[PDB]
Structures are given as structure tokens and as C-alpha cells.
């Protein structure tokens, strides 16, 4: 026969190897493919769809799970009080875990690109107010007050007919890609911090609720990309599935 010489790797079964395999059914023809709505071509299509960000990931009670989906805002004392805070890191344990983006990230080792968070005010029509959403790039410790938070990337949000506002977390990194940030050494890939402050105050007339809620929705921008597939950190199974 034709002189050959097998090399290392012979007989191995590489999970991700893309080769040819003998077909079990000769001349078999699959059922025609009808037209079906909502076909997906690339996962990045899903990373751009906003899903609810659990900024208020505090309640763990059985009856209080639905309230992690929104955080409160109310009449204050007028000293630029802090409202909420959270890390901007997408593939890190925290608020982003409730989003589709955060979930898809779990399947990739690295990501790159700008992120965006849209805040929707669900108070009453008579309620007014201005907030200051700030994004603090790496190195900046959690701003102690508004006067410190406003020194970074931010946006002053005015409640009105347009219920929502979008905070764009621009891609400000030293490296082209970021691996998932965790506590310790990998905190090198942290994205930064987001913090909502009262620019002025939540004002309301007599007869209207003194407390309203905000719902945060998060997704990725058009320049967002991911690479190097891996398995999500969690496996939803304890014993064999029956």
C-alpha cells in the first residue's frame, strides 16, 4: 500500500475536533426546512437585547425575590445622597448575573466592547427628579460622595415624558480584551463602578406616592465581542437527573 507514518495524536478523541464521520443512513434526506420566525445567526445578536439587571440583589427571602428586579428612589434631605451602587463587570458575580449578557458571557473566557445600562423610572406622572449616574473607570475607589463620582464618566438624568435614560459604559481598558474579573488577582480586569446619586431630589405633590422604583436594563453595544469558549461557572444539577 501507500507508505504512511501515523503521528502523535493518533486515536485521540478531541472534543472540539471538527472532522468527518461515517454517515449512518445512506441516501437519507431530511425534512424540508419551513420558514420559522426569530432565527438566530450569531450570539452577539442576543447580547444586544436588554434584560433586567438586578441592581437590588439584596432580598433572598422566598417571597421577596421579585423585588431584586427594581430599586427604590424617594424624597430625601437634599445633600446629594447615594442611591445605589454596583460593579460594571459583566461576567462577575453580582447584578449582571440576572442578564442575558451576563449569562452568555459565562460561556466565553474573554470579552471586549462598550456596555450600556438603561434606567426606567416607574414613579407617577407627577413625580419629578434629577439623578446623576456615574461610571468610575478602574483604579477609582467607590466614590465617597457625588462631588467625587461626578469626576468620572456620567450623565445627569431628568425624569419626564421619556421615562428612561441610557448610561453608556464606554470601553475604557488597557488590554484589547478582558477575561472575567474575580476577587484577587483577576480584579486586574475590573471594568469599574457605577453609582446613582440624587442630582437634586425626588419631588412630588400631595396625593402622590413618596416612594417610586427604577428598573435597570442592561446589554452590550455594537462593538461588543467575545472569544475563547468555556463552560459556565455553574452546573444546574446536584444528583443524576431522572
Amino acid at each position: 500500500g501507500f507508505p504512511t507514518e501515523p503521528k502523535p495524536g493518533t486515536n485521540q478523541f478531541l472534543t472540539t475536533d471538527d472532522g468527518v464521520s461515517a454517515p449512518i443512513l445512506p441516501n437519507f434526506h431530511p425534512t424540508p426546512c419551513i420558514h420559522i420566525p426569530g432565527e438566530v445567526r450569531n450570539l452577539l445578536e442576543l447580547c444586544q437585547v436588554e434584560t433586567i439587571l438586578e441592581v437590588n440583589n439584596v432580598p433572598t427571602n422566598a417571597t421577596s425575590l421579585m423585588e431584586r428586579l427594581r430599586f427604590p428612589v424617594s424624597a430625601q434631605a437634599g445633600k446629594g445622597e447615594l442611591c445605589a451602587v454596583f460593579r460594571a463587570d459583566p461576567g462577575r458575580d453580582g447584578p449582571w448575573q440576572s442578564t442575558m449578557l451576563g449569562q452568555l458571557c459565562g460561556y466565553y473566557t474573554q470579552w471586549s466592547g462598550s456596555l450600556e445600562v438603561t434606567f426606567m423610572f416607574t414613579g407617577s406622572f407627577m413625580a419629578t427628579g434629577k439623578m446623576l449616574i456615574a461610571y468610575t473607570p478602574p483604579g477609582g475607589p467607590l466614590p465617597k460622595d457625588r462631588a467625587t463620582a461626578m469626576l468620572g464618566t456620567h450623565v445627569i438624568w431628568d425624569f419626564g415624558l421619556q421615562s428612561s435614560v441610557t448610561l453608556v459604559i464606554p470601553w475604557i481598558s488597557n488590554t484589547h480584551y478582558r477575561a472575567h474579573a474575580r476577587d484577587g488577582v483577576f480584579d486586574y480586569y475590573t471594568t469599574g463602578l457605577v453609582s446613582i446619586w440624587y442630582q437634586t431630589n425626588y419631588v412630588v405633590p400631595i396625593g402622590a406616592p413618596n416612594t417610586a422604583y427604577i428598573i435597570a436594563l442592561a446589554a452590550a453595544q455594537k462593538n461588543f465581542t467575545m472569544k475563547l469558549c468555556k463552560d459556565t461557572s455553574h452546573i444546574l444539577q446536584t444528583a443524576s437527573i431522572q
Binding site: 468527518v20 454517515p23 445512506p26 441516501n27 434526506h29 426546512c33 445567526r41 444586544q48 421619556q162 455594537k222
Partner: protein
Amino acid sequence: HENSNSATEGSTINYTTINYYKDSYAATAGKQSLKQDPDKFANPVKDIFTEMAAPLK
């Protein structure tokens, strides 16, 4: 020639695969076309609006 029985037969996407058998579903996964349609899920609005505009007029 060869049987056209792969799951992606008649798809508006091009593939570069390798095969050694007469049944094309045995071919490698290959490389594919990188087209995307974000709007299908992210902006499925009937009357599209600009980003410069106030969504609700």
C-alpha cells in the same frame, strides 16, 4: 455528484466544508458567513425612530 442532505441545505448562508462520503451531512462543520440581524430582537419596532429623536412624540 453528491447527496444534498445536510441540515443547512437551502440556507441563505455559505459554508466551506470537507467531506469524503456521498452524504453531505457527514461533512465537517466548516467555516460560515458572518451576517447578523440585531434589530430582529433588539429593535423589532414597526415605526423605527432615530437615536437623536425623543422616542415618544
